[PDB]
Amino acid sequence: LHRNSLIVLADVALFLALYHFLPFEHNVVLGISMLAFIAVLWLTEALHVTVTAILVPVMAVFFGIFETQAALNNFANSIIFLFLGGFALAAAMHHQGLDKVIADKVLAMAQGKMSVAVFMLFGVTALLSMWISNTATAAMMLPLVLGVLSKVDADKQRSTYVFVLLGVAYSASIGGIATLVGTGPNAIAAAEVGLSFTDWMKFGLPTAMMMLPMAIAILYFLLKPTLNGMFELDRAPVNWDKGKVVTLGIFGLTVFLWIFSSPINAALGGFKSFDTLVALGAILMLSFARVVHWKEIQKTADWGILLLFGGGLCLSNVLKQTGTSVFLANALSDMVSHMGIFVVILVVATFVVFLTEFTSNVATTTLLIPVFATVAEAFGMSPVLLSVLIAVAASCAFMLPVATPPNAIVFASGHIKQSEMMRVGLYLNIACIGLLTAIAMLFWQ
Amino acid sequence: LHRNSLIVLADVALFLALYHFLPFEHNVVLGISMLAFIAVLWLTEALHVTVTAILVPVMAVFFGIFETQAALNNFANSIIFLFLGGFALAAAMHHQGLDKVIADKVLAMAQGKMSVAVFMLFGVTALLSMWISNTATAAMMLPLVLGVLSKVDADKQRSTYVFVLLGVAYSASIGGIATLVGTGPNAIAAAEVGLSFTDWMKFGLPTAMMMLPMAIAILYFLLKPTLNGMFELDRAPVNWDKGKVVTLGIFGLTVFLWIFSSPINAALGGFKSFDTLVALGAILMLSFARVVHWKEIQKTADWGILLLFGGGLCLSNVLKQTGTSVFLANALSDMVSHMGIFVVILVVATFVVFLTEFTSNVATTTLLIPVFATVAEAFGMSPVLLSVLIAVAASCAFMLPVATPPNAIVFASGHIKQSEMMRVGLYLNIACIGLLTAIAMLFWQ
Ligand code: NA
Ligand code: NA
Ligand code: NA
Ligand code: NA
C-alpha cells in the first residue's frame, strides 16, 4: 500500500525480468540482475541503506555465489575497524567536550568582529569535521552559529545570516574530504583499493585546502553584507579540566602515528593493517586512561554505516566472482577507447557531483566504487584514481537538502529558501567538477 | 591512581613476569602469558569486557600469532550475525509492544487471584526471556511486578513480596537457557562447537522445563505467605493493532524455520549456516513488512556483546595456534585420567556455578569455553558436552547481585536484603549442580 513497498515490488519484478530475459552466460545474468536490484535499492532508499547492505550477502549466498561465512567475512574488513576507532576517538572528545573548547578558544580570538567571526566559524567547522563526522559536526555547529547571528538579528537582513548557515553546511562536507576518518565514502575507497591513512590525506587534504576558500568565495560573491556587525560572547567560558589535555594527548599521539605510519611500521617489522591497529590502540588508550566509557562509544558509533561498508565489499566481490566486472569492461571497451582520459574523468566527476544531490553520500559511493574499481581492474588500470575521485565527488553535495544531512540541518532553520541553496550549489558543483578534473589530471605523473 | 588502573598495571606486570620467567617453548609461554592476562581482565573487569575483547586481536597480531585481517575475521563469525538477527527480532516486538500484550493476555487469564498471578508472572518472564534477553526482560518485568505487589502492600509483610521479585529475576535467567538466542553464553558455545538453533534447544529447553519448577519450589519452601491476596488490574487494556499479528506472524515463521531447519535446509540444497540466513531473513522480513525501523535495531542491538563474541573466538584460535591447548591437555593428562567423567563434570559444574556469582555470565563463558573446548579437543573428545555445560552453568547466577543484571535490577528495589538472596542462591546453586551433572550424565549415550 505504501510508496516504497511498491518500489521494492517493482524491483523484485525488474530483477525477475532481467533474470529470465537477459541473453548471456548465466553468471553474468545473475551479476547484472543483482547489480541493478541493489543499485535501485540504494538510490531510491526504499529499504534502509543498511538493510540493503545486509540483503547483499543473503542474496550472494542463496544464489550460490559465496558460502554463508565467506560472504559475512566481508563485514570484518580491517578498514571497518579503523572507522570504529574513529567513532571512539570522536565519542571521547565530544563527551569530554574538547570540541567545545576548540570552538571557543578560536572564536574568542576574534575580539568582537563579525568579519573575523564567520571566517573563523568555517575554519573550525572544517577542522573539527576532519575527525568527527559531517552530520555530527553540523548538528554541533548549529547552536554556535545561531548564537553569533543574533546581533545582526534582522532577518529582513537575510543574506548576512544565510551566508553563514550555508557556509558551515558546506564546510562540514569539505572538511570530510580531508582524512580517511571523516566521512564514509573515503573509507569505502580505501577499503576497495587498499589505501593507508597517510595515503588518503595526500589526496584529500590538498583538495580541502583548495576547496574551502573556493567555496566561501562563491558564497561571498553572491549576496554578502557582513563587513558590518558586532559580537555577543554570551555563555560560560571554557577551560582545560581533567585530561582534556589527555584526550588531546591521545588524539595527538594517534594522529602522529597515523601520519608517520609508513616509517614507524616499516621500522617496526611491517605489521599488516598498521592504521587499523593504531585506530584500535586508540580505543584501548582512551579506556585505560579512563577518559571515555564504552556506552558512549556504542551510542556514537554508527553501526549502520559499519555494516554498510561490508555490504558494498560483498557487492564488489559479487561483481568479480560472477565476471560481471569483466563483461562490463568488454561492453564499455569501444566507448572508453573512443574517449580521452580527460573525457572519462570529466564524465565521471560530473556524474557523481550531480548524482550525490539526489541520494546519500555513502549510498552512492557504496554503489559506485565497486562498479568502477572492478571495471577499472578488468581494463588493467590502477582502480585508485577513479575510486578516490568518486569518494571525493560524492562528498560534493551542495544543491538541495536531502543530499546530505548537513544540508537538511541548516535548512530546518526555517529560514533558507529552496531556490537560494539550489543555485549556489549549481555554481559550486560546476566549480568543483573543474577543480577535481584539474587535480585528478595533475595527480597522474 | 584508580583501583582498576592498578589491576591493569599489576596485570601488565604479571604478563611480563610470566613472559620472561616461564620455562617452556616460546609459543606456549606467549599463549600462557596471554591466557592469564586476558583471564584477569575479564574476571576483574578492570577494562570493559568489550575493550578487553578488542585487546585480544591487537595482541595476537602484535605478537605475530595471526595477521591483522585473519584475526579480525573472527568478529564476522556466522553466529554473531544470528545473534544480531535475535536483537532485531526483539527490537521489533518491543517497539511494536507485542511483549506487553503477551503479559496482559496471560495475566488477565487470572481473574483476580494472587495465587495464580505470580505463578503466571514467572511463566511469562521465562517465555518472554527465551527470545529477548535477560537484562531486558528483567527491566521490562519490574514495573509489571510492582504493580501486582501493591494490593498486599504491607512491606512488614515482606516475604509475600520478595518471593515474587527474586522469582522473576531467576525466571529471566532460566528462560535464557532455553534457546540459542536468549543469552550470550549459549551463542558462545554454539560458535565454538558449531551448534544449530534446533541443537541447542534439544539441550536447553528440557533443562529450562526442569529448572523453573525446581527454582520456584525452593523459593516457595522458604518463606511464602502468598495463598492470600487480591488483584488490582489497573491500567489501559491491550489489543492487537496494525500487524502485531504481523510481528507474531514473522516471529512465528522465523521460529518455525529455526526448529524445522534440518529438513528444510536439507531439502533445499544444504546451505551453510542456514540458521544465520534465517536470522538475517528475519531482519529483512521485518523491514519489508515495515514493522520496525533500523534506528530501533541499532539501539536494541548490544554491539558490545557482538564484539565480545569474536574476542573470545580470537582467543580460542590463539590457544590452538600457540599450542597452549595441547600443552594444558598434557599437563592435565594425569589428573583427568585419575578422575572419573562424573568427577570431572561435577568439578566443572561446581566451578562455573560459583564463579558466575563473582563475574558477568558472558565474561566467564567467553573465558572458559575456549580453554575447555580446545583442551577437550586435544584429548580427542567432542568439545560439545563440556561447552554446553559451561554455557548453561554460567547462566546459573542466583546468589549476590552484580552476578547478573537481573539480580541487580530486582535489588535496586531498595527492599531485598543482601543476606536473604545469598542463601536462596546457595541452595539453588547446589540444587542446579545436581540437576546439571544429572542431565549431563543422561545426555551421554
Ligand atoms: Na567530517
Ligand atoms: Na549525497
Ligand atoms: Na533471555
Ligand atoms: Na554471572
Author numbering:
A (entry chain A), B (entry chain B): 18 to 462
Provide passages from the article that reported this PDB entry.
To validate this idea as well as to gain new insights into the mechanism of human DASS, we replaced eight amino acids surrounding the citrate-binding cleft by their counterparts in NaCT, which primarily transports citrate6. We also determined the succinate-bound MT5 structure, which revealed that MT5 binds succinate in the same way as VcINDY except that T379V in MT5 makes no contact with the bound substrate. Our transport assay further showed that MT5 retained the succinate-transporting activity, with the KM and Vmax values both similar to those of VcINDY. These data implied that T379 is not essential for the succinate transport and NaCT may also interact with a trans-dicarboxylate.
Membrane transporters belonging to the ubiquitous divalent anion/Na+ symporter (DASS) family move Krebs cycle intermediates or sulphate across the cell membrane typically by utilizing the preexisting Na+ gradient. However, like other well-characterized bacterial DASS proteins, VcINDY is known to transport succinate and other C4-dicarboxylates, rather than citrate (C6-tricarboxylate)1319. Our structure reveals a homodimeric arrangement, with each VcINDY protomer comprising eleven membrane-spanning helices (TM1–TM11), two re-entrant helix-turn-helix hairpins (HPin and HPout) and two interfacial helices (H4c and H9c).
